[PDB]
Amino acid sequence: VLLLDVTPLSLGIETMGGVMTTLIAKNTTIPTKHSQVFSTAEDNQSAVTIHVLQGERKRAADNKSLGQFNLDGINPAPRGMPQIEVTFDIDADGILHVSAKDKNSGKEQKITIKASSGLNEDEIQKMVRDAEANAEADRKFEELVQTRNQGDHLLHSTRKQVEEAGDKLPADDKTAIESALTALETALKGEDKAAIEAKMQELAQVSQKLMEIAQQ
Amino acid sequence: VLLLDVTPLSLGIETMGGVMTTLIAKNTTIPTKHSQVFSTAEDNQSAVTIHVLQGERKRAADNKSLGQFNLDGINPAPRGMPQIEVTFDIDADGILHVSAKDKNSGKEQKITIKASSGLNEDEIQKMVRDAEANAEADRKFEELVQTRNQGDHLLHSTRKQVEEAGDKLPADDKTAIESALTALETALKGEDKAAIEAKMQELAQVSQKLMEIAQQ
């Protein structure tokens, strides 16, 4: 063959923290099909928005939104335990079928995206140039989001542990731990990587007993 | 300047599943310093081996081992909660100082690696060619390890939940759940991605009540 039908840009979904996570890489020959198992961001979460993105930027908002749908009826479970399988399937005509399947509930939902959706040739070139020009800014956004995600999981896990310990956790211990959780949650509302990391470290420094107890 | 001192290859550490995780990318100008926070792979783990690797392959064993050390005295906590900060610092002379700091215990350990350690120019070219020739095999190894890691965390989390539920979990429920845990753990000892995923899915299909209970 002299030509191939290939994707001009990355295809994926928005994930926790406002980041684009790629399911089909740029320059993949079609037809193609790729699945990845994802999960809930918080304990007992009953629904996920699957938000389909096209582009090369790390920030979800900087890419081209192709459409979105919900999968609900996710049954109560700890954060990150339900198995939500997301599949991108591009058929021979270039139509994209995105589906999300909750292996724990059985429920499935899909959206169909026309081959003509998304960015046109000029906008595709602009996207590629943009990703090149902002490769550093995007790297910094990416590392801030992973640190903001780590802090949010540490915040939520420690709150659960506190409540589970109840009276077993000495007053002083609880005081130091609570103080630090509030400090972290404030840092998480902000934009500063190092501040989030310092509040995380402040928490590791006073949580010793809580851990111990939680492990008993 | 007409020349720069730059790394010829990736530097990092071995992580859970026998994978190389990069701390300093290939072609970084020295001096340079990079930290990433890592953690324990199992509940109550008291020590981590920091195993310093040089190279471009995903499998740890396929890269060049520069040395290793332990950090112990990690205090009991749930898997993934202790904050273990690993820092690679290459100074102006090309000497690499790797340290690991447990923010929760305060304990620190380091190793110093001479600038002349690791692969020579020929071996560096061979490494680069090898990574090129095996880019697919390495991608498949990488995805198998992430699936094997996900199953191992799901195995370990579900075992904890079972034990915590004790008598609250109906016999039948427990039976189906236990069956599936054994099936997963066997799949994890194997080499087959799809088999691991099917055992995970078998577990999501019978764990509904356990989750519910665990969430109460």
């Binding site: 994802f38 999960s39 809930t40 009953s46 928005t49 954060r79 990150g80 | 996900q150 989390s157």
Partner: peptide, 13 residues
Amino acid sequence: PPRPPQWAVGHFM
């Protein structure tokens, strides 16, 4: 359990 106001797709443990 109280269900959170959260829609984010997260990573599978």
